[PDB]
Amino acid sequence: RPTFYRQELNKTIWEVPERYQNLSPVGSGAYGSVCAAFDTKTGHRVAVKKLSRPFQSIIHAKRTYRELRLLKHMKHENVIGLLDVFTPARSLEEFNDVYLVTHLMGADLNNIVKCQKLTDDHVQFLIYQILRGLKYIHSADIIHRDLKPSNLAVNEDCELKILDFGLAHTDDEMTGYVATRWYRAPEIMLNWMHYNQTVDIWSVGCIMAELLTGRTLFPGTDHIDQLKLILRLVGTPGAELLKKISSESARNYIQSLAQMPKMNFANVFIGANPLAVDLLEKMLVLDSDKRITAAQALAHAYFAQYHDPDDEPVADPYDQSFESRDLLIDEWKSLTYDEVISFVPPP
């Protein structure tokens, strides 16, 4: 066991192993507080996150376990990984605090596209990396659920990593003129049907459009204004898709709208590479059953310069059976403790 030292930073007690030095507060959401630090063992600048109230309820205890299981599993060049996890506790009886350590991220995709469009070669490389990461994530039957520019880290060499997996956002966070909703697939924005991995491909289409134009594709002022923007581009549904909407009330609302045909995407994305237009048409499909998958998209001719099927790996199998399990707070806490002490660091 390493030696720990204590300090107070912005009214918060931080107790961390001696290897982590020069701690500096960076942010604090509702799930914890974050400090930048220097890791003397690896030489990396790192983010250290102290979870806030990790075991305050059954819901919160299960969410802590879910987050740690997911971060321990992810081992791919285009996905955030876990460098370390620690607790100052010396036994399960005194276990209360969880700290997570990752590589410190600089700019996100917003700070690169803010009010600005990129060249086609840059769009090819950035979207290729998102899809390479997504092929890996989806091969473990994981759905990200919250892909958007602020959840994509980018460096000066245009290299990209996916972060901030959806751990299951409030009603108020999705209300109004907000980027938190602009990248969401229509079937989950209005709870038409059950989530599945195709929702992530819709988000990639929205991101790719915004890189090509410099502007948000569907900047709706509320859920219904956004749906109207979506259907104007991709057309109103046929009876095939209407059949698959379990909400009778949602079926009734869609049929209240005047019918609209799918628009010509070459007249929307003026001047774009025709191969980019073709790929957008295959991602931005209303019926989720018919969207292109990440593995299929990597083989599309838009990525001929980068595609290498011997260098696009899949993930080890991932056991999610805990998600349908009903446990008490102290049982979720015990499972989490076991995962902290069994962590093996990367090479």
Residue numbers in the known binding site are 26-34, 49
Q: State both tokens at 223.
A: 């859920």
If contact means CB under 5 to 8 A according to the sort of partner, which of Mg ion, ligand SQ7, Cl ion, none does residue 270 touch? ligand SQ7
Of residues 241 through 280, those in contact with Mg ion by CB under 5 A are none
Separation CA 212–CA 283 (nearest Å) = 15
Contact in structure between 2 and 19 (CB atoms under 8 Å): yes
If contact means CB under 5 to 8 A according to the sort of partner, which of Cl ion, ligand SQ7, Mg ion, none does residue 112 touch? none
Minimum CB separation from ligand SQ7 for residue 210, in Å? Answer: 10
Separation CA 47–CA 37 (nearest Å) = 6
Minimum CB separation from Cl ion for residue 247, in Å? Answer: 28
Closest CA to 137 of 339, 293, 304: 293
Minimum CB separation from ligand SQ7 for residue 269, in Å? Answer: 4
Of residues 153 through 192, those in contact with ligand SQ7 by CB under 6 A are none
Residue 287 binds to Mg ion (criterion: CB under 5 A) = no
- Of 74-82, 145-153, 322-330, 336-344, the window that binds Mg ion (rule: CB under 5 A) is 145-153
User: Among residues 65 and 269, whose Cβ is nearest to ligand SQ7?
Assistant: 269
Q: Single out the residue of 77, 120, 164, 339 in contact with Mg ion (rule: CB under 5 A).
A: 164
Minimum CB separation from Mg ion for residue 108, in Å? Answer: 8
DSSP helix/strand/coil, 293: coil
Catalytic residues: 164
Binding residues for Cl ion, rule: CB under 5 A, are: 2, 17-19, 81, 87, 89, 96-97, 103, 148-150, 179, 318-319
Residue 212 binds to ligand SQ7 (criterion: CB under 6 A) = yes
Residue 69 binds to ligand SQ7 (criterion: CB under 6 A) = no
Q: State both tokens at 237.
A: 């549904």
- Taking the alpha carbons at both ends of the chain, their separation in whole angstroms is 19
Would you tell me how many other CB atoms lie within 10 Å of the CB of residue 57? 11
Minimum CB separation from Mg ion for residue 70, in Å? Answer: 15
Closest CA to 18 of 34, 2, 1, 35: 2
If contact means CB under 5 to 8 A according to the sort of partner, which of ligand SQ7, Mg ion, Cl ion, none does residue 100 touch? none
Q: How far is CA 161 from the centre of its chain?
A: 10
Q: Please report, as a single letter, which amino acid is at residue 269.
A: F
User: Among residues 164 and 281, whose Cβ is nearest to Mg ion?
Assistant: 164
Beta pairing partners, 35: 25, 48
**Half-sphere exposure (Cβ direction) of 169: Cα atoms closer than 13 Å:** 18
Residue in the structure block whose two tokens are 């628009």: 263
User: Among residues 77 and 164, whose Cβ is nearest to Mg ion?
Assistant: 164
Q: State both tokens at 183.
A: 């990248």
Cβ-in-10-Å burial (0-12, 13-18, 19+) of 6 comes to exposed
For the annotated binding site for ATP, the residues are 26-34, 49
Residue 151 binds to Mg ion (criterion: CB under 5 A) = yes
Of residues 258 through 277, those in contact with ligand SQ7 by CB under 6 A are 269-272
The site for Mg ion, by CB under 5 A, has a size of: 2
Residue 199 binds to ligand SQ7 (criterion: CB under 6 A) = no
Of residues 272 through 301, those in contact with ligand SQ7 by CB under 6 A are 272
Contact in structure between 176 and 164 (CB atoms under 8 Å): no
Separation CA 262–CA 96 (nearest Å) = 54
Residue in the structure block whose two tokens are 């048409």: 281
Minimum CB separation from Mg ion for residue 105, in Å? Answer: 10
Q: Which residues bind ligand SQ7 (CB under 6 A)?
A: 117, 212-213, 269-272
Q: Which residues bind Mg ion (CB under 5 A)?
A: 151, 164
